[PDB]
Symmetry: D3
Subunit: 127 residues, 6 copies
C-alpha cells in the first residue's frame, strides 16, 4: 500500500537483541489545527504492528504545522496526531537545495527520535 522509507533497529524480541524494521512513508494532510488538515502537504513515517500504525515523524516544506490527519485502523474513521515544533534541515535535489522541516509526534521518546534522525541522515542526500 505504501513504500518503505527509513530502516531502523528496534530492541527485541529478546533482551539485548536488535531487529531491523523498515518504517514506511505515506502522504498525509497536516495543518495548524485539526480542521486545517485538508490537502496532502506532508510525508509521515510510521511503523506497522498487528493493532495498526504508529506514526513517528512528519516531513514537510511548511514550518507552521501542529496537527496531522491519518486514516484509522481498517478504514474505521480518522485519527489526529499532535506535532512537536519542527527542526529545519536542507536536502540536495536535482532542482537545488530544498529546505525541509522535520516534526516529531508528541510523545515520541528520544531513542526513537534519534533513530529517525540517523536513518534520515544516512538515507537522504543532505546539503
Amino acid at each position: 500500500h505504501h513504500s518503505a522509507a527509513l530502516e531502523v533497529l528496534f530492541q527485541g524480541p529478546g533482551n539485548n537483541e536488535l531487529s531491523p524494521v523498515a518504517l514506511r512513508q505515506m502522504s498525509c494532510a497536516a495543518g495548524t489545527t485539526q480542521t486545517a488538515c485538508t490537502d496532502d502537504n506532508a510525508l509521515a513515517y510510521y511503523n506497522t504492528t498487528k493493532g495498526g500504525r504508529f506514526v513517528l515523524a512528519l516531513l514537510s516544506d511548511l514550518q507552521d504545522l501542529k496537527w496531522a490527519r491519518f486514516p484509522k485502523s481498517d478504514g474505521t474513521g480518522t485519527i489526529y496526531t499532535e506535532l512537536e515544533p519542527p527542526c529545519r534541515f536542507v536536502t540536495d535535489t536535482p532542482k537545488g537545495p530544498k529546505v525541509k522541516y522535520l516534526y516529531f509526534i508528541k510523545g515520541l521518546n528520544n531513542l526513537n527520535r534519534g533513530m529517525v534522525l540517523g536513518s534520515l541522515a544516512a538515507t537522504v542526500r543532505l546539503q
Copy 2:
C-alpha cells in the same frame, strides 16, 4: 586520518537547525579486562572534536568486551573507557549472515544512541 562511516544530524548552530555530521571509524583495542586491551579487535565510531575524538560506540565480532583503551590523541579523560553490554545484530555478508556486537560507550544519551542505530540500520546491509 580515518574514513567517514555514519551520517547523523546534530542540532545547531542555533535552536531548531539540524546540521549534517559524518561520524568516522577507526580500529581500536577492547577487552574483557583493562589489561586485555592489546590488539585491535573492534571498530570505533566517533565524532571529531577540537583536540580529540568523542567515541560513541564500538562494533566487534567478539562478545564479553567491557573496556576499551583509546589512543592518547583521542583526549580521553580516563585511561580506560567502559562499555555497555552489547546489542546483537545480524549483517548480510557475501558469505551469508554474520553476527555482530554493538557496544555503546557508557553514558551515551538516548538521542545519540538512537542516531547511531538509525544510521547503522540505513547504512549497512542487514537482516
Copy 3:
C-alpha cells in the same frame, strides 16, 4: 505455562493509546556469574511477543546476584541476562516481614522500570 503477575500499560498500537498487558512470572536460576546460575532462586517478570520472551526484572531473597539464566525461544538453548544492582524492599507475609531484592535487567528504560515498580507496589502487600 507460567502465571500472570504484574499488569502494565504499554503505549500502542496507535499513538497516545494505552494497552493493558499482564507480565508473566517464572522461577529462574540467578547467580554471581553465568556458571553460578544453577538452582532456581529468583522470580523473573517478562513480556511475551511473537519472537519470544523479554525479561524486565527479577525478584530474589538474595542480594549478590549479577546474572540470570533463561531458556531460549522454543527450547533452542540457554540465554544469560545481566542484572543491575538491586534495590531492597520489604513485603508483608504470613510469616512476618520478608526482605526482597528487585533487580532490573541491564538496558531497561526508566519508563518500564517505573511500570514494574508501580505495578509491584499496587499488587504485593508491602510492609
Copy 4:
C-alpha cells in the same frame, strides 16, 4: 483530607532502599484554556509534600484539556499547571467499558510516569 489512590515505591531514605508511598486523589478543575478551569472535571493523583501537594497526573472523561488550576494549598509555583496530551485507555465499568483520558503533568520524568501507569494498571479493572 483526601483518599489514598495509587501505591508506588520511591527510593530512599538512602541509596538502594525502596519505600512505599500512597499517592492520593482529589477532584480538580481542568480546561482547554486557563479561563475554562472552573468546575471540577478531573481526578488529580498527587504526592503529599511538606507544605503542599505535587500532582503527577489527571484522569478525566474529557478530551482536549490543556491546563489545570490547582488550589492555593497545593503550593504550585504558577497559577496554571500545563498538561501533556492525554493517553487513552479503557476501564471495565459495571455498565460496560468506559474510555478515560490520562494527562500527565508536563515535565514529569519517565520513572514517575511509569510508576503511575503500572500502579493504575494493577489497581483499576481494565481492558
Copy 5:
C-alpha cells in the same frame, strides 16, 4: 553568566564553559514577542548561539524570538512551562520564573539549575 561543565573533547573529560546572556523578546504567543522582557542564557557555538533557558519576571511566556544570527532554524522557539524561584536581593526577595527551551535534555536542564543555585543568592 552561568558556568557549566560540558563533556569533551574526549570521552570522560569535562571542560568548563560560561553560558552568556542576551535580552530576549518573549510572549504568550509568537505575535506577542514584541519587546524585550526576558534574559536568554546561551552557549556559543561555531556559527551561532544555542539558547538553553530564559529568566523573566513574567510567568505566562510560551514563545521566544531569537536573532537569525544565532544560526537558528526558525525565528521562534517554544518554551517549557516555567518554574518559580525566589532570589534574595538587598531590595528584598524577588520572584523570578525559569523557562527551559522546549526539548532541552535533562542533563542540560540540570546544569542550568545547579549553576543558578550556586551563582545566585536564593531562598
Copy 6:
C-alpha cells in the same frame, strides 16, 4: 557544599537545597573499600542521606561503602565511570574525578555538574 534547586513542594516551584559532603571509602571492588579516599555529596532525607556523587583523586573506583545510618538498602553502591576535571588551586592545577552513583537520573547529574562548575575554580 554544593547548592542545587529541587522542584517542590508544589508543582513548578523550586526550593534551594545544600548538598553536604562526607568522607567515603571507595574502591575498585567492594572488598577494597577499606580507607577513606573520596568525598561523597549527599542530600539529607527524612531518615537518612541519599548520595549523588563522589569526588576523588583516583580514577579507578567502582564501588563505595556508605553508612547504614544513611537509610541505605545495601552497604555498597556502585559508581558510574568517572569524568576528569581540573581545578585551579593556588598550589597549581589539580586533577579530580567525578563519579555519579549508578542510575542517578540525568537532571540530578546535571545539577551536580552545574553547581560544581559555579562553585569551584575550574579550568
